[PDB]
Amino acid sequence: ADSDINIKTTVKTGDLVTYDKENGMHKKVFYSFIDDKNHNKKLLVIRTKGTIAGQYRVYSEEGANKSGLAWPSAFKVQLQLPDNEVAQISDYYPRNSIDTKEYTLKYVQPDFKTILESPTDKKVGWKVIFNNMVNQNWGPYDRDSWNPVYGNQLFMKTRNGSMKAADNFLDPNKASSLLSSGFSPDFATVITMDRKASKQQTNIDVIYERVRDDYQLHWTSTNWKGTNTKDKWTDRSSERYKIDWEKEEMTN
Amino acid sequence: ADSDINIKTTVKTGDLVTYDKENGMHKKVFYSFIDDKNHNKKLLVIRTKGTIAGQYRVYSEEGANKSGLAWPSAFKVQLQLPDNEVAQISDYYPRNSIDTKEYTLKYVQPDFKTILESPTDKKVGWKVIFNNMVNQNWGPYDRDSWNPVYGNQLFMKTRNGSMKAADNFLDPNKASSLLSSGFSPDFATVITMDRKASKQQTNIDVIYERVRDDYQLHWTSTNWKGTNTKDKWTDRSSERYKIDWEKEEMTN
Amino acid sequence: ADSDINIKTTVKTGDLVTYDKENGMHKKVFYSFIDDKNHNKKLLVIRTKGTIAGQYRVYSEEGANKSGLAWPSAFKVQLQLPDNEVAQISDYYPRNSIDTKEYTLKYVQPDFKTILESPTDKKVGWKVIFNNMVNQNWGPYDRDSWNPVYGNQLFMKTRNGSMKAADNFLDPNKASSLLSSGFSPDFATVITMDRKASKQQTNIDVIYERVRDDYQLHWTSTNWKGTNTKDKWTDRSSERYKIDWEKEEMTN
Amino acid sequence: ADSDINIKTTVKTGDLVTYDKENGMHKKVFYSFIDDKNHNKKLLVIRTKGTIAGQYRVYSEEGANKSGLAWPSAFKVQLQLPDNEVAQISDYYPRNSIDTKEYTLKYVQPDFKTILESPTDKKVGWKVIFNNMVNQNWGPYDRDSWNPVYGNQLFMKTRNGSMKAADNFLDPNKASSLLSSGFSPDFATVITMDRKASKQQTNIDVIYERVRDDYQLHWTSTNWKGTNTKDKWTDRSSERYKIDWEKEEMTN
Amino acid sequence: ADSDINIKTTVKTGDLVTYDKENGMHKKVFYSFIDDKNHNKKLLVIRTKGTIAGQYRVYSEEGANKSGLAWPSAFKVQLQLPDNEVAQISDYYPRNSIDTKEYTLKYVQPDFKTILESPTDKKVGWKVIFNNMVNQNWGPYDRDSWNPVYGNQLFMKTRNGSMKAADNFLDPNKASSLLSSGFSPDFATVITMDRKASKQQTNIDVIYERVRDDYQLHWTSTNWKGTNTKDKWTDRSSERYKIDWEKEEMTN
Amino acid sequence: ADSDINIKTTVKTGDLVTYDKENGMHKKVFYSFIDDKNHNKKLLVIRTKGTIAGQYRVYSEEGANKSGLAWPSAFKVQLQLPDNEVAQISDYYPRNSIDTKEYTLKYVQPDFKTILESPTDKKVGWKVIFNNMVNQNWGPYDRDSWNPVYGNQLFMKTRNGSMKAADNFLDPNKASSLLSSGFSPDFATVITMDRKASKQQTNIDVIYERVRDDYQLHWTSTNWKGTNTKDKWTDRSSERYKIDWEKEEMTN
Amino acid sequence: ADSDINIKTTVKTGDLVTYDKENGMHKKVFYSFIDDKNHNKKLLVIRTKGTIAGQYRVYSEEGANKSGLAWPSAFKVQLQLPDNEVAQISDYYPRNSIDTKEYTLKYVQPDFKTILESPTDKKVGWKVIFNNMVNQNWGPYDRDSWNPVYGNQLFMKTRNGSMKAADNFLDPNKASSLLSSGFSPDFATVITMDRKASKQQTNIDVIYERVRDDYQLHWTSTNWKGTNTKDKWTDRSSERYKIDWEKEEMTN
């Protein structure tokens, strides 16, 4: 774009790490302060790296003939900001890209899409939802999968199994590396501030989220049928981090 | 092109952000002022970044047997200028590219095309129209899709469904990331000015647009038939941004 | 080429913009003056950017049973020069490329080709003619398409239609982005001048052209048959731009 | 990401090599100390090169009609840290990537995956598990392969063989070059420390591991049936390496 | 190659342009003089750019039942040198490349080949012959194409046509862009001269040529049969250009 | 890796060439000495280039009805080191890569693998074994190929041949260029030494090897049956090269 | 390789051109002298550019019913050196690459191979032999092609032809551009010399060669049968060039 039209400062960085031991959600708020004499506004490029655990474990089981699985079905990152504050979000990467395909029809569908919720001048939010995953190398099953006899086959290790339900669940490692051992949101977003702002200080509200699912699964005496109730439990890790743009620094 | 024929300044930048809370449309007019001693004219490379929301919501419903959906079917960006003013649009990116294919025939058709309306020396306009989208992994349906029995299948979640029409609509996330959570135009265009212009000041009219569509859908007691009336409602976010080329700055 | 044989100045630029409001034909003559002490001749790299309108509109119609369509089928750019003047065209981009294919046979055929008419030492001219376009996702129809019953299917929206001929024409946006909203020729060419030339001044003739075609289409009471007469109307935007090689500047 | 948003010190490295002759596990802990005036925290990029041997050998056998094979089915690298210590792991490469495929369905499956276990602010750990491998160019067999008649065909050189079981095992070189002559982890992870930390010294717990498998295989007088007991033997190699951030050096 | 073995001046340029108005053969002799202290011999990289017209026109016709077509089938550029002169040709780009294919068999075959005739220490010459071209999207016909009933189908617009032979020939634009509007050679060659040569002057003979072919085509009262006699007419544009290596300049 | 975490001296080389005329094994030990102030240990990057001949010749024959072929099956290169010496091998290139394929199953298999035997802190060893080769464009035969009637078809030029066994062997050039005219090992390995080592001198044991194969082939009066006994003859070229890290030099 | 292990002078060139007018064998011996203070030995990179003619002509014929064709089937470049001299060849480019393919089986096979005969410390020699070529777009015929009825189909223009054998041979241009107008070797090899060598001078023996083949072809009164006797004629072009490493120059 730059060369198509024949067209040809000290930055302060830092990092803040915190860990929610109860939820096991890693946090990473890497940042860099940018000031430009030509630019009429101050800058701060926020890197939203880190990781959110998978916690693909059997939370409990109702005996050997019925068991449930607590696993994550949608991750999110929503760097929301109070509307009272005058801090402006300028740009954010990645940006929702136009879908592409070929025409018989074919296209690429990643298991964990990377969508970006319609932001505003205050709140910027993603949603790394679960599209579909393949079990037993047979069909990319999604959350909506359901069968009259087999029920949901989201993680059914064996159709006509004879083991304990808490032990006959699909191996976490045979599936993707996002549920078994977590997903690592590595996103970014820049916020700009007035050059002649009175208060060179706002509040950054970092809110990591995820959508755990309760996948109750039981034997119908002929095959294993499971039911999944979306958003059975949700875990949020809110956190407020204050900046000092006068000193070009943000701390816990 | 440059090397094919054996051929081998201080720039002022800035950014202006505004938000239409009623229409929920982000605005972004990032820019840079370029002046060259060799060039005989002044420059201003205008970046047209930002985002226009989708607002893919059930605006109203006529009970459970008939409902309508308000969703966007065409986005636009038209940086128009009054014909009285002498500001000249020189070049703009992207430029309408020549279609290509292979010959049986195959080609690539993005869901949201990026067309450029025939500009002039005053107004430059694009139109990111909706080409076609795939529902239930079966056919890239377009706005013109219609069936004698099934009607339009643009967002019919279930053909022979039995749920409420306001609840049996296709999931926003299963479709593209443009309708559900907005589309983010990232365009550019340069306007050049006379070196010896008497008044180093004009008015930039940024007009973000979009075409919401009313898609009424109802059960025919056998299957769901929907009808879409194009351009039922349109939303425009016009705004005038005055420049100071003498100071090489543009403000709200 | 350079490295295959083991082998390892101030330039004045500018731009001239003009617009033909009658024909809607944008003009752009971006340029740069190059002088090299090692080179024995002066240089001027002329860039032929800009755009030519499509004007894909129903110019008139003979009622609802017969209509004609005014659309462009061949654009051109011919930077000609009077033979009296001693200005020499040295090189021009693009240059006619050798066709390639694979051998069953397959190759790529663009909708709007970019041919280069056999130039001379005075006149250099391309011709962006129309090769073929696909309608209703069925066959890449060309100007020569004709059927005994259906006639020409170049822009027939519906074969056995029942709407008005002025309203039952193919949507401009469903076709390519060249006829509907214009095509943007971005060409280039360098002319070199004698180092010891007596008069450091010539006349550059920029002639943007186009060939509108009359696509008369009518209902045969069974299906819509259309006829196209090539070169029914042509529009030229000639313009002379004088150079000052002594000052290394060209003005209107 | 950096350029999408229009945005445009002395480091001390070192070396520490040790070798466990009993288990034959090579170790390499290449590193570099980074300090930045703009950054508010100290840095240390730890590289986890080296190799873990394969030891694809017949540990013992029960006559010629029954034999077992000791071969590695999962490697690991777990740079853990005591929770008492305040040393913070910031980022780690590689990061679990989102799975990709095309839709008939197709995707790529490496034999030795590279998963990353859900870490915390103290412990970072991989798990290079075995996905699936192909024998006799017929099917990518995995650890879970089992047949009622042929048993497990994981390394069965000949189905209806007649040689000694300790001599009729699949050649180590015909399979991948990981089991036969070892797998070489080349991973990394960076740890950050407080700029005003009282004690500039922590303890790096490098624990190389692996999961050797006992593959008992015997002749059923008609064909060879084998049974593999996962995690039959494990060979951890713990090690503590102390750092001196005040001197920016780490030693054994 | 250079880095595979672990291994890591003022140049005078210029150009000479001339045109043959009778034959329409453009000439371009772009060059550069290179002298190196480490090199023991002088250098001159001669670039053989330019264009040779196609003149794909009906030179004459024998009424409407028989016509001939004057079209070029072999272009050449032979920078020959008298054997008396000691000017040495060292290297020349392009150099004949080894053919490649895949094994069913497939490969790429350009329409207009670029062969390099076996040169010597004095004479260097290419030959841009015609390989094959496709008509009516049916078969890549070559010069040797011949049929007992249809004759040569090289440029037969319609097999069982009824139009005038001077008007029922294949459109020049539907075929390749080489015969219709000329072919533009972009060649090069470097000649080296003795550092202690007594006479720093030789004679460069640039000879652009062409081999026009007569394609007589007539109606056999059932279909159009044509015959092509190779090398019917040839046109040569010889030219001698003297060098001044002492001044490192070459002029007309 | 480096840029994924937002992270941004005099070297003495040399040469040592020797040749074993009896075995025809060329040797090249290109190297470079590296010392870094930030590094706590010295470095030496040893390059294992050179070439080992193929000697694909008929060593002897038992008349015309039975013959043997001496052709190579492995080119081992084992730079070993005595365990008494404290010279440490840190890293070595190439490092065994994880296999890749697509899932019907497909993958790539080179004829001459480049395996890396499980090394230690003293010894680093490769083994360029033969995977499989294709004869008569029919099947990638390996050393394990055997047929009840045709025997081994490894280099059987003609199945039902009638020529002399010493003359009816497959042409060396029709197979790969490795057996016929040698394989050229171009490998490397870096060794590090203590900065405060008392003795700055060790011994590099370069041992070029090879595993010739005896391919006895005879006519069974109906077809040619051959037998190959692996490791029939092996040839070694041991050599000791002493380093002087104090002078940063290594000689024969 | 270099960066995989975390690791980050005046040169005299020249020219020497000679030509064998009898055999038409061009010669080019481009070179560069390299001396490094860190290197313990001197260097000289010899480039083997130039070209060898093809001479694909009818040397003689036996009437119109039998003819022979003198065409080259193997070119060679053997930079041999006397064993008495201590000039050491260290490395040479290209070096034989390991074959690759995919597994049904597929791979790439060049028409004109570029083999490298097993060299030594004195002699380095290639052999540009002919692999296979395709005639009439039907089968990649090789020198070994033979048929009981049609004989050898290597250059048989027409199977059941009726023209003169001296005139019914395949066109030289329809085949590859290597036999017709020569093959152009572009090889290289570096030789290293002792830094403290007493005599800084050796003898470089450049020997261009070729292996012409006599392809007799005659009509069997039903079809043309051809026979090719390999290595019928060879035309060696020996040449010795002396170096002066003390002056870092090599001349004729």
From Swiss-Prot, chains A, B, C, D, E, F, G:
GO biological process, one term: cytolysis in another organism
Effect caused by changing H39 to I/R/T: No oligomerization, altered hemolysis, near wild-type target cell binding
Gene Ontology molecular function terms on file: identical protein binding; toxin activity
PROSITE patterns with a match to the protein in the record: AEROLYSIN
Keyword Signal found: yes
Result for mutant: H218 to I/P/R/S: Nearly wild-type oligomerization, hemolysis and target cell binding
Subcellular location: Secreted
A UniProt-annotated Pfam family: Leukocidin
Subunit structure: Self-assembles to first form a non-lytic oligomeric intermediate, and then, a mushroom-shaped homoheptamer structure of 100 Angstroms in length and up to 100 Angstroms in diameter. Interacts with human ADAM10; this interaction is required for toxin pore formation, disruption of focal adhesions, and hly-mediated cytotoxicity.
The record's note on its domains: The mushroom-shaped heptamer is composed of a cap domain (comprising 7 beta sandwiches and the amino latches of each protomer), 7 rim regions whose protruding strands may interact with the membrane bilayer, and the stem domain (52 Angstroms in length, 26 Angstroms in diameter) which forms the transmembrane pore.
Sequence similarity: Belongs to the aerolysin family.
Annotated protein name in UniProt: Alpha-hemolysin
Lineage, highest ranks first: Bacteria, Bacillati, Bacillota, Bacilli, Bacillales
